[PDB]
Amino acid sequence: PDPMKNTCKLLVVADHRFYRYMGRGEESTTTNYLIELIDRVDDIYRNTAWDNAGFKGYGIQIEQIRILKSPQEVKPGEKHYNMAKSYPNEEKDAWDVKMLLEQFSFDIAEEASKVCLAHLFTYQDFDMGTLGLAYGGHGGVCPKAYYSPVGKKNIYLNSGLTSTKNYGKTILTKEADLVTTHELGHNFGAEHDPDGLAECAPNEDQGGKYVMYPIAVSGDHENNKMFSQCSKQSIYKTIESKAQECFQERS
Numbered sequence: 001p002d003p004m005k006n007t008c009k010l011l012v013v014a015d016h017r018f019y020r021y022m023g024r025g026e027e028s029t030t031t032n033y034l035i036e037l038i039d040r041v042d043d044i045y046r047n048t049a050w051d052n053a054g055f056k057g058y059g060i061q062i063e064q065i066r067i068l069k070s071p072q073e074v075k076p077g078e079k080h081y082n083m084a085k086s087y088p089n090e091e092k093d094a095w096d097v098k099m100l101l102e103q104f105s106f107d108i109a110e111e112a113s114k115v116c117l118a119h120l121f122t123y124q125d126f127d128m129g130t131l132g133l134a135y136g137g138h139g140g141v142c143p144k145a146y147y148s149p150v151g152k153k154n155i156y157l158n159s160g161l162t163s164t165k166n167y168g169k170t171i172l173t174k175e176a177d178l179v180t181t182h183e184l185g186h187n188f189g190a191e192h193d194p195d196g197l198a199e200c201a202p203n204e205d206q207g208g209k210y211v212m213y214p215i216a217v218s219g220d221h222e223n224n225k226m227f228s229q230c231s232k233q234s235i236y237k238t239i240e241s242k243a244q245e246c247f248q249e250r251s
């Protein structure tokens, strides 16, 4: 491990929904929530031995927090991830998750090119219990250009998002930590843990599921906060390939 190239710096964005419903319309409350969450998620990453040996001490650090206090004014037929209305169905509380991630990546392209990852924190009730989305596991850590034919410019796939609202209520902080861990897990290169690999998807008596399980099943079992051997193997290759590219020294 290179201690000079072990941290993935983050651009953290809180939208107007997050600022209002999680930040109680205050900058201090918004930022304190995000600062503590990322630090707790960083403890999971930094304490993980990706090769089950000495390849550890890799994590994340906030470089900047962009706080969007109010909705983005849009011209007719124009869209933006921070606009007041959901897209494609404005009658719904939330965007289609995949479209929101594409939109966020488009709008944040200039800033995303200068950071290891960009993460959007929102407060919207996605359909069928979805809590987040991210690129990787193409995309993930270190900006990789994608020419958007619709958008007519390069966008970067070093992005992900977390919503702290599910089924009409604010999720617990212990649950939000797992969402962000999981989405950043995809950014770091991990796929979902499959049922066919018992080592990677244990029973409840064996400590439960690991963080990369596709379903936010529990939140109270030991393994829930940890990466499976399947995730470690995938992430191990990514860090080996990407740390030199965009990782920095821990501040």
Ligand SMILES: O=C(NCc1ccc(Cn2c(C(F)(F)F)nc3ccccc32)s1)[C@H](O)[C@@H](O)C(=O)N1CCC[C@@H]1c1cccc(Cl)c1
Binding pocket: 097, 129, 130, 131, 132, 133, 134, 174, 175, 176, 178, 179, 180, 182, 183, 186, 192, 209, 210, 211, 212, 213, 214, 215, 216, 217, 218, 219, 223, 224, 225
């Ligand atoms: O919303 C998602 N995950 C959130 C989580 C799943 C499990 C996590 C941790 N976790 C666990 C526990 F797992 F530890 F138990 N118990 C938890 C209890 C509370 C909170 C978190 C918890 S967070 C999607 O996976 C998304 O990232 C994705 O890839 N998606 C989204 C759409 C397309 C694609 C997609 C692609 C293929 C299949 C699906 Cl389901 C979705």
Ligand SMILES: [Zn+2]
Binding pocket: 182, 186, 192, 214
């Ligand atoms: Zn996932």
